[PDB]
């Protein structure tokens, strides 16, 4: 039904659409591993879109800032340092957040930041360091997409038609 | 705002972009 160049401009109208401060989207694509022995599902950065809402640390984090900008000044927060953070991220299928998402075909909601750091998964914990308090991942046949706010957000059953709606399922 | 944008630059990329 969908495809890459639709991937992105979805993940927007979801963000978008929805009435609750989500701060970005996430797509999880799937790829195949081997070694020299066997064959793996792996997920990794489709693509994803960010809406939003020391000075060592501020100085480094503007300077990678400006080095993506001549590839292709202001304050960078850690919810935006969390997101580009994120492209470089992989998950084996059924491990992690993304992973265990995608093997069951599960949609994992973390509310609070007690629900984030009792997770157990990794990129929770790192998520709610950078000031995040909900986290979701929604299992898709095209992959998985993840959402995740500064604020708590209980699972709507409007954003769940959205996100129905934009996706690929079995 | 203007970080936003270049966020949304490499991502639209970042599947092809190997080395970020």
């Given at each position: 039904?969908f495809?890459?160049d639709?991937?992105?401009?979805?993940?927007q109208?979801?963000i978008?659409?929805?009435?609750?401060n989500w701060?970005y989207?996430?797509?999880?694509?799937?790829?195949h591993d081997?070694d020299?022995?066997?064959?793996?599902?792996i997920?990794?950065?489709?693509?994803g879109?960010?809406?939003?809402?020391?000075?060592?640390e501020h100085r480094?984090?503007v300077?990678?800032?400006?080095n993506?900008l001549?590839?292709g000044?202001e304050?960078?927060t850690?919810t935006?340092?969390?997101?580009?953070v994120s492209?470089?991220?992989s998950?084996?299928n059924?491990?992690?957040?993304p992973?265990?998402?995608?093997?069951?075909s599960?949609?994992?909601?973390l509310?609070?930041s007690?629900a984030l750091?009792?997770?157990?998964?990794?990129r929770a914990?790192?998520?709610?360091?950078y000031?995040?308090?909900?986290?979701?991942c929604?299992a898709?046949?095209?992959?998985?997409?993840?959402?995740?706010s500064?604020?708590?957000?209980?699972?709507?059953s409007?954003?769940?038609h959205?996100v129905?709606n934009?996706?690929?399922?079995? | 705002?203007?970080?936003?944008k270049?966020?949304?630059?490499?991502a639209?990329?970042?599947?092809?972009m190997?080395?970020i």
């Amino acid at each position: 039904q969908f495809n890459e160049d639709t991937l992105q401009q979805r993940l927007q109208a979801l963000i978008e659409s929805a009435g609750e401060n989500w701060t970005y989207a996430i797509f999880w694509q799937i790829s195949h591993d081997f070694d020299s022995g066997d064959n793996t599902v792996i997920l990794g950065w489709g693509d994803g879109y960010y809406k939003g809402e020391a000075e060592q640390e501020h100085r480094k984090r503007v300077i990678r800032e400006l080095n993506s900008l001549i590839s292709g000044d202001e304050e960078v927060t850690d919810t935006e340092w969390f997101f580009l953070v994120s492209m470089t991220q992989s998950f084996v299928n059924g491990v992690g957040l993304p992973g265990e998402s995608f093997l069951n075909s599960r949609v994992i909601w973390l509310s609070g930041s007690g629900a984030l750091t009792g997770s157990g998964c990794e990129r929770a914990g790192q998520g709610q360091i950078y000031g995040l308090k909900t986290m979701v991942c929604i299992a898709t046949q095209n992959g998985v997409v993840e959402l995740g706010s500064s604020e708590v957000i209980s699972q709507s059953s409007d954003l769940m038609h959205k996100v129905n709606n934009l996706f690929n399922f079995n | 705002s203007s970080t936003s944008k270049l966020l949304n630059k490499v991502a639209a990329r970042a599947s092809s972009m190997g080395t970020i």
